[PDB]
């Protein structure tokens, strides 16, 4: 995190912040709750109350990420609707504005499609986490039985050491202890192997999505040169638009670069 | 778009799709509507019914992108909650799992903060679009007056050419035509100059966010090597964790790279 | 298709569209359904509900193309009626108009006859498709039996592995598997050989019909020069018509060209 040695909510600015000052906080952060939905905030609480004790926090994480997934599909549909609206609105303006808006809407629709693919990959990762949630929830009854049986052993040996079930309960306890030891070993292996794999898949999806949107942004930034900021005096008017071929070539190149992109084609090199 | 010469919904696979087959569609795409909220789908319709005719589609786009912004802040809060839940859940597991989960939660919280910054930039871009929406909505009464006055001229010249207001209405029409010509010129300039600038700012925010999340993904992928997939037999147990310094160095390097990142530091080079 | 990189229903204009702007949409596209008939839209649904599962979409295609054929015979009868009506109406006008209308009606009747011949060829192609529909519908019971028998094998081997019918059912399954393999091979060969042949015959009929109507259109366009656009002042009147021989020669040449036309005589050379 970009925090600092301070007792205030202010954070340490970065190079981008120094070059570009941050905008004021969004006007869409209205004071209702930031909730999004009542079911959104109640599903998590319902999942975190019932079920096995061991599989409680993990179930909460699964439900929270399911809400993440729902909100992401909502924002993907919203963004594709915004692209459609921009494409529709581009008609009323000049030819150059119309073409630029159409290409920008195409790029935003492509971004929405990539978001949907990332949504599918995120659901795959969520199911991978659900598997470990289920196995830990199934493991929990073993240790619950172990503690119940050891409590019974302590109670019987305290109330009457010369009980008829003097050693049968102890032998059952030791075999349950062996079963619980095997269960704990397999739980550790599976949890730690599907955490490092589900999160690896999630990070692969993250980097692929980020690279694709970065390519989209770069190609749109290069396309935006066809639009002109030259202002016209009220009497005058521009000559006819002639940059159709340039826009066509740039969108063809964008599509080709997106198709060619692979895991090894990522230019991001962390240090 | 990655479409193909086909009459089916199937799309042309890319290099990543060929290398990695796509997962099945998400189980969170439940059949209610995909709506998200009733207000979400009614605000747009309300904005697209009233107001000036010219500033109707643009108002719909503004409202749709406001819904985009709300859903994005919702998903940012959801993701930060997921990071907090993962950090909390990391306690119950081994020391290495605890440390890895803590660092992953830190990275996800950083991603959420970057999402919030992108949300602020998106709201700035939305306000930039709102400015052109307002100016076109103010321009529309001029042309509405022009058409009303020309309709009155046609009606008067058809019903009785020798009307007392024979030429005063024509002179008022020509001065209104000059005003409308100036208005159309300034509307074209401002719309086409704030579209190429608001979208340029939006694409700058997009590429910055994408590069930052790509760096986060790469650093997390490099951090995930400290986690081990080696399985332990039920009897045995590992030696104590000793990779604290490696994780500390990798998160310090991630923070330094994020702070150092600037607009010119982007390694994405579109063709 | 002549689509474009756009999010609107507008299509990319062609050279003919640039030279000749497209007319407004037809006034005969009235809002009832575009149905044509209740039986037209219910026959397909009835065919697509019953019958073998494999021979379901193909039966729907056969029924839809039967409706195509019925509507084509309807339009051929309608066009021949239009030609008859034009020939009848030509009497009330001048001699040149009468002769031109008579020859145009002859050409339209010839076009209707060619449409009827194409209708017969289309029905032949539809019967060719019906043959493969029937063979796939007969093949489907084999695989249905195979799945039923393998389901029985799984059920018997799960409920009681030491069943009296331990291996007789397996041997019956393997012989059914051999029969189904032969059936699948022959189905693939026949389907893929009668698709490439029925569609080849259909395309031969298409190109022959198109060339014949193109020759008819060219000959009618050359005949329309006998009609004169010269306007007469109210007092004056033209001399008597004398272009009977020219029209006779042009229709004789049209008939000779239509008779001489063969498959190798087509001047259309695709690239």
Numbering used by the authors:
A (entry chain J), B (entry chain D), C (entry chain K): 1 to 271
Any passages from the paper?
We isolated MCC–eisosomes from S. cerevisiae using a gentle purification procedure, preserving a lattice of untagged Pil1/Lsp1 structural proteins bound to a presumably intact plasma membrane bilayer in a near-native state, observable as a two-layer density in the protein tubule. Two novel structured regions of the protein were visible in our maps: (1) a folded N terminus (Nt) that forms lattice contact sites with the Nt of a neighbouring dimer, followed by (2) an Nt amphipathic helix (AH; residues 39–48) buried within the lipid density of the cytoplasmic leaflet of the bilayer that runs parallel to the BAR-domain helices of each Pil1/Lsp1 monomer. At slices around 5 Å deeper, an array of small voids in the membrane density begins to appear just below the AH. Visualization of the electrostatic surface on the membrane-facing surface of the Pil1 dimer revealed two patches of intense positive charge adjacent to the AHs.
The yeast eisosome, composed of the BAR-domain proteins Pil1 and Lsp1 (hereafter, Pil1/Lsp1), scaffolds a membrane compartment that senses and responds to mechanical stress by flattening and releasing sequestered factors. MCC–eisosomes are relatively stable, and have been implicated in sensing and responding to plasma membrane stress: various stimuli, including hypo-osmotic shock, heat shock and mechanical pressure, cause eisosomes to flatten and release sequestered proteins to affect signalling or transport functions. Here we isolated near-native eisosomes as helical tubules made up of a lattice of Pil1/Lsp1 bound to plasma membrane lipids, and solved their structures by helical reconstruction.
